[PDB]
Design a protein around this ligand. Structure first.
Ligand SMILES: [Zn+2]
Ligand SMILES: [Zn+2]
Ligand SMILES: [Zn+2]
Lengths: 48, 96, 48, 115, 48, 46, 258, 124, 186, 67, 47, 48
């Protein structure tokens, strides 16, 4: 229903308005590196 | 341990000397069978080895009754870790 | 950076040599387990 | 996928200098030598030979990152004596002792195979 | 065609990100404000 | 223009047509396996 | 201010290994000669595999992989071959490559072992190393086959580990640690080295502060692709060549600065 | 092909991704030519308390030297670590599997004595 | 639907598993002397969980039928081997009593996820997401129970010369440094 | 599956050893005697045959799909 | 007679005889076997 | 909790604890290798 479309954690308020899917974002595994500063992240080329 | 990077004195004591008393819900290994903990023990046996005290260390290895009592304590720890998560996240959500 | 590059010269490990005490210590451990186990048994015969 | 190709360890490209000299400004008579597409198998020998001069006050090398193929050899020499001169004498001293070592290895082979 | 690849002042160019760009880096579950922080991009070869 | 398929259990080969029911001629076996391609392959031995 | 004079003393020379002692040189020179044994010695290994047909149980890239790691006799050709990417040829030639051809169909009820012998060169000097048995590439059931053409090219151990001529390069200095670089907690438990010269009463040598690493003991065991002494000769020549090209670029850069 | 980020694991719950891949000349090496294939963290051990990983590694040296597939049933009493060490000592090694690694970059031998030997790793 | 497991049978203070059963049982495929002949011989029997509440169970016979300062001396059954309390994934762990028990649980999770030759006819099977391995090896350090799961026939993983060393700092927080030349050798 | 051509750590050519290893096992040697009869001193070369499972002989039982 | 200290190799003989006789999945196979052999007829007659 | 969150993680922390002990001494070449990695070094080798 409409109330079931809005009421859930997967609904419109929480599921789409509060927390929504975003463009310009990447997700991959992290592996350590001690040869770069604390504010540097070493991203891949195919992400960049 | 002395640097405090990883581990504590308890891990040294359990690897070298003795694992120690295994617990389920803050007390000893309960009588799941009729008045005994495992069917290898005589009934009404309140001794150390019958009730879950492990006298071996991880260097020597555990006897099978001590292995099973150790697995009970570990299952209690994993149950705590798996049940904690949702309730703590919901407390965080309500607070924010 | 500089403590990792000293650690290449130093080196740090962990082993099974780091988990074994000398036999006097093992005798102390087994004497203490035997004493406490006999003490629990005599507490039990007091309790009965 | 993002695997760098295997020739990235040693092949240069158009617009890459093999060696780059940058004069240090913190102390007098010091240079950073940026060697592109090399590793410890060059800079370690150059560092150990530059420690054998009585006129080099500092001889070090580092890789910035092990996934990027370049080293930096920092040289500080005594004044009146250019660090570029110490570097080009270290290379000649290495070529000298390695050619001598190769000739003595040849003579040792001829000794061993012929009794 | 190369006739409309000219640039005058005021165009935007959505360029691939280079070294020195700023990104936001987080881990679910984001518990506190240091679970989501800003790093500088370094381009390293492998895919992590 | 016909495509040659290998007849599963029979291991023999036969032609096939567009809009043709997939059947072997030897025993009518229903699973065909398409032959390996004729263009070149080249592997870096790494 | 100059280079010390090293010297070589060979303890044994076999067709597998060479065991020798380099005295009066620095540690970094010695480690670099080890690392140039492992990496910078060029040999000939298969790098271009064209599978004409394959019906074996191993897939195509597994067979091309196993053809990569086969050692080839490159004792004198690898000094004559150009690197493939450096040649001016039409992308393959006999000056930068060695052609191999394999053409095996199993027409019998026995499991037929496609070994390294079935690799057929056009160059009679560059053949696979296999007294010893041949290197098993792939087994075949009756009905299966494989045909391929494989070009081998010059390369070295940094590029890929199929261009590594050495089985094992043992390297040790100061086998009784008079230098005390390694610090044993209880040196009685430690076994003596092959090159130790202390009596069995004594555990390790007394410390000297004024000493330095010298008398480097090497054991270079070849895989068969080169004789174990031409690994050492090719390594010394390659390290001198790397240093000479570094000096040429250095001279260009100094002339550019002035 | 195994690259960095690929997740490997022991037979003891000792997982971990590949941090970096060095070539053979960069990897450390014993007095013989043996380099490691994997180098795992020493800090992965003492809080996790997988001593059985260390004992698998020690029995692995004993097994690969003796030329037999070694036995690791849990409740045995015919195999403890002291018998494994006495079997390892006969093949010319240290009692407890430590072995002097040389450094792969500088060549200076590492001051500590690195525990080394074969375990059984699983690619996930 | 009840869940039982076989145990040996202990008359007065002696096992009924005599030497002649081992002699007839080593020579299988010849005498046709199976497990079921040993169940028929009145030597082992299946005990379920209700009946374990009323059984006095010897762990191992070498400790628990010999006279000492006697514990009970009224054993009815004897456990066959304690390693048979473990599952199929906890049986492939070497020395799992030396570990900590969450580590055994986590390996029991990971052992289901290891790549390996999952089946012998994988070239016929059109499975979605087949992960097979080039050169899988049996473990050098194995259990006796891997012989019965046939883990030495379809294994999952390679024996590797690990070293446990702090190094450049890429094996920092549960990660491992690998050998590029080894990986280039398959 | 099939025997590796090189030992993973050393690069010692171990791929030519497997059939002779099977011959020395069936000629009633121990495994440790068979390995150094084949001449494998380093244990990393000994694990390459000592813990190989020759799985390709199972894969050759099946009839080839292409023919 | 009895097995004094060769018990360690005598128990794995009987474990091997168990898993050669039964196997690892007798629960699934024996359960479905007793189902389709007896219980389906019991359902058909008990209707 | 008005304290840092970064700190020094495990292997750098054990290596810096072993590093800063009283009985740690460094040869001139090992010093020049270590001082190569300081970003904030003003180019002056300290007096031994
Ligand atoms: Zn047909
Ligand atoms: Zn050419
Ligand atoms: Zn090897």
């Amino acid at each position: 229903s409409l109330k079931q479309r809005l009421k859930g954690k997967e609904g419109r308020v929480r599921g789409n308005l509060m927390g929504k899917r975003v463009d310009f974002s990447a997700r991959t595994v992290i592996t350590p590196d001690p040869n770069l500063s604390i504010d540097q992240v070493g991203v891949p080329r195919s992400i960049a | 341990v002395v640097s405090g990077a990883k581990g504590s004195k308890i891990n040294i004591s359990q690897v070298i000397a003795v694992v120690g008393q295994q617990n389920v819900e803050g007390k000893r290994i309960p009588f799941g069978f009729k008045h005994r903990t495992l069917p290898h023990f005589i009934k009404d046996d309140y001794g150390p080895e019958s009730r879950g005290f492990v006298e071996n260390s991880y260097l020597a290895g555990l006897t099978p009754t001590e292995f099973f009592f150790h697995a009970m304590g570990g299952r209690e720890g994993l149950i705590d870790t798996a049940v904690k998560t949702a309730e703590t996240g919901y407390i965080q959500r309500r607070l924010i | 950076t500089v403590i990792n590059n000293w650690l290449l010269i130093e080196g740090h490990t962990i082993g099974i040599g780091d988990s074994i005490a000398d036999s006097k210590t093992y005798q102390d451990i087994q004497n203490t387990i035997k004493k406490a186990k006999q003490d629990v048994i005599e507490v039990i015969e007091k309790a009965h | 996928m993002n695997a760098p190709p295997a020739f990235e360890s040693f092949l240069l490209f158009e617009g890459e200098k093999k060696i780059t000299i940058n004069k240090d400004t913190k102390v007098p008579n010091a240079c950073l030598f940026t060697i592109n597409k090399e590793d410890h198998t060059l800079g370690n020998i150059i560092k150990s030979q530059l420690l054998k001069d009585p006129q080099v006050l500092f001889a070090g090398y580092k890789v910035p990152h092990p996934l990027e193929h370049k080293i930096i050899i920092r040289v500080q020499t005594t004044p009146d004596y250019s660090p570029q001169e110490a570097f080009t004498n270290a290379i000649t001293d290495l070529i000298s002792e390695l050619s001598l070592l190769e000739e003595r290895f040849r003579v040792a082979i001829k000794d061993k195979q012929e009794g | 065609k190369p006739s409309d690849l000219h640039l005058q002042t005021g165009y935007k160019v959505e360029r691939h990100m280079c070294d020195g760009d700023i990104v936001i880096f987080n881990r679910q579950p984001t518990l506190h404000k240091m679970s989501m922080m800003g790093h500088r991009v370094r381009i390293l070869p492998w895919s992590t | 223009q016909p495509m040659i398929y290998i007849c599963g259990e029979c291991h023999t080969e036969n032609e096939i047509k567009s809009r043709d029911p997939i059947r072997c001629r030897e025993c009518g076996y229903r699973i065909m396996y398409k032959k390996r391609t004729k263009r070149l392959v080249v592997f870096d031995a790494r | 201010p100059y280079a010390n004079q090293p010297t070589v003393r060979i303890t044994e020379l076999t067709d597998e290994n060479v065991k020798f002692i380099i005295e009066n040189t620095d540690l970094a020179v010695a480690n670099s000669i080890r690392r140039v044994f492992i990496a910078e010695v060029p040999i000939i290994a298969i790098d271009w595999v064209q599978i004409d047909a394959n019906s074996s149980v191993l897939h195509d890239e597994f067979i091309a992989h196993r053809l990569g790691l086969i050692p080839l006799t490159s004792d004198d050709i690898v000094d004559k071959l150009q690197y493939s990417r450096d040649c001016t040829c039409e992308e393959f030639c006999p000056e930068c490559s060695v052609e191999f051809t394999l053409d095996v169909r199993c027409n019998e009820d026995q499991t037929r072992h496609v070994t390294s012998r079935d690799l057929i060169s056009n160059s009679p000097r560059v053949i696979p190393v296999t007294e010893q048995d041949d290197i098993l590439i792939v087994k075949l059931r009756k009905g299966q086959e494989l045909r391929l053409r494989a070009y081998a090219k010059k390369g070295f151990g940094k590029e890929h580990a199929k261009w590594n001529p050495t089985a094992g390069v043992a390297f040790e200095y100061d086998p009784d640690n008079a230098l005390r670089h390694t610090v044993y907690p209880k040196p009685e438990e430690w076994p003596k080295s092959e090159y130790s010269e202390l009596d069995e009463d004594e555990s390790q040598a007394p410390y000297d502060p004024n000493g330095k690493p010298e008398r480097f003991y090497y054991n270079v065991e070849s895989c068969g692709s080169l004789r174990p002494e031409t690994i050492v000769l090719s390594a010394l020549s390659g390290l001198k060549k790397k240093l000479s090209d570094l000096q040429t670029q250095l001279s260009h850069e100094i002339q550019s600065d002035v | 092909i195994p690259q960095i980020g690929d997740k490997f694991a022991s037979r003891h719950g000792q997982k971990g991704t590949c941090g970096i891949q060095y070539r053979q000349e960069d990897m450390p090496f014993t007095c013989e030519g043996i380099t490691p294939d994997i180098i795992i963290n020493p800090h992965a051990i003492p809080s996790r308390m997988t001593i059985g990983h260390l004992i698998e590694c020690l029995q692995g040296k004993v097994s690969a030297n003796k030329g037999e597939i070694g036995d690791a049933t849990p409740f045995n009493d015919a195999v403890n670590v002291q018998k494994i060490s006495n079997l390892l000592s006969d093949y010319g090694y240290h009692l407890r599997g430590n072995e002097v690694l040389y450094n792969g970059f500088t060549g200076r031998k590492i001051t500590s004595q690195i525990f080394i030997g074969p375990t059984y790793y699983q690619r996930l | 639907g009840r869940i039982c497991r076989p145990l040996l049978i202990v008359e007065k203070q002696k096992l009924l598993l005599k030497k002649r059963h081992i002699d007839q049982l080593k020579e299988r495929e010849y005498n046709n002397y199976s497990w079921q002949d040993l169940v028929a011989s009145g030597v082992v029997e299946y005990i379920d969980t209700l009946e374990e509440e009323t059984v006095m169970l010897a762990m191992t016979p070498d400790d628990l039928q010999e006279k000492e300062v006697a514990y009970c001396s009224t054993y009815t059954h004897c456990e066959i081997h304690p390693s048979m309390i473990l599952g199929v994934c906890a049986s492939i762990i070497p020395f799992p009593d030396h570990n900590q028990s969450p580590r055994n649980t986590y390996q029991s999770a990971m052992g289901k996820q290891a790549m390996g030759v999952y089946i012998t006819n994988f070239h016929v099977r059109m499975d979605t997401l087949a992960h097979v391995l080039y050169y899988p090896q049996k473990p050098l350090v194995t259990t006796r129970s891997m012989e019965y799961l046939r883990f030495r026939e379809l294994p999952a993983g390679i024996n590797s010369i690990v070293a446990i060393a702090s190094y450049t700092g890429y094996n920092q927080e549960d990660s491992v440094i690998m050998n590029r030349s080894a990986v280039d050798r398959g | 599956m099939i025997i590796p051509v090189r030992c993973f750590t050393c690069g010692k050519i171990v791929g030519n050893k497997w059939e002779a290893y099977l011959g020395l096992l069936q000629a009633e040697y121990t495994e440790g005697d068979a390995l150094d009869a084949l001449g494998l001193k380093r244990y990393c070369c000994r694990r390459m045959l000592l813990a190989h499972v020759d799985l390709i002989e199972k894969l050759l039982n099946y009839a080839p799909l292409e023919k | 007679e009895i097995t004094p200290d060769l018990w360690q190799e005598a128990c794995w003989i009987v474990i091997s005889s168990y898993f050669d006789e039964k196997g690892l999945v007798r629960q699934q196979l024996d359960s479905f076997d007793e189902f389709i052999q007896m219980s389906v007829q019991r359902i058909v007659e008990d209707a | 909790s008005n304290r840092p969150v970064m700190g020094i993680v495990q292997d750098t922390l054990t290596a810096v604890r072993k590093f800063t002990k009283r009985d740690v001494f460094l040869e001139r070449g090992e010093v020049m290798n270590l001082l190569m990695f300081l970003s904030t070094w003003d180019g002056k080798v300290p007096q031994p």
